[PDB]
Structure 1
């Protein structure tokens, strides 16, 4: 099976920093009884104001982003990326 992608509102211009912070958080909790259950975070080059979080359940996203200041306006609601649009998240175009 395959997880879904969820959008999470993020302080504008802090998307890359926040994705990296969540990487550290995941590693920090990996040998605890409260591990992060998310699978990845994507911060595409030109996206502003949100990040994408990969997880099987929305609740896993909420649990991972709790306490993360840059994501506070994305804590109560995350929107699922429609399955047909999941590769557009990872699309890069060069003119």
Structure 2
């Protein structure tokens, strides 16, 4: 199973940035430079970063290259602790 990495994102642009990343993946899916990340999560109340599921940080870097909203997250992504990995998808009400 892959890991999750946090990537700094322009505040308030998390959903738009995720949508740009899927459009990029779809555009490149039949090329020789596909995205190797596994998912992106933008939790309802998270501000200033997104979560990306991938096996390698280098895959994250390559996927997020050129994404303006992630320019401040291009050089460093932080791994989500496995024991806290399910918390990413918790939605309390």
CA distance in structure 2 between the aligned counterparts of 1:26 and 1:89, rounded to whole angstroms: 22
- What is the Cα-based RMSD across aligned positions, in Å? 0.4
CA positional deviation for 1:49: 0.1
Query: Number of aligned pairs?
Result: 93
Q: Deviations over 1:49-75 (max 9, x none)?
A: 000000000000000000000000000
Q: Who is 2:66 aligned against?
A: 67
TM-score (structure 2 length as normaliser): 0.99
TM-score, normalising length from structure 1? 0.97
Q: Secondary structure at the match of 1:37?
A: coil
Runs of 4+ residues deviating >2 angstroms: none
Gaps of 5+ in 2: none
The whole-number CA distance in structure 1 between the counterparts of 2:51 and 2:80 is: 9
**C-alpha offsets along residues 25-60 of structure 1, whole Å, 9 cap, x if unaligned?**
111110000000001100000000000000000000
Task: Tell me, in whole angstroms, the C-alpha distance in 2 between the residues paired with 1:25 and 1:83.
Answer: 28
Shift, 1:90, TM fit:
0.2
Structure 1: gaps (5+ residues): none
> How far did 1:86 drift?
0.8
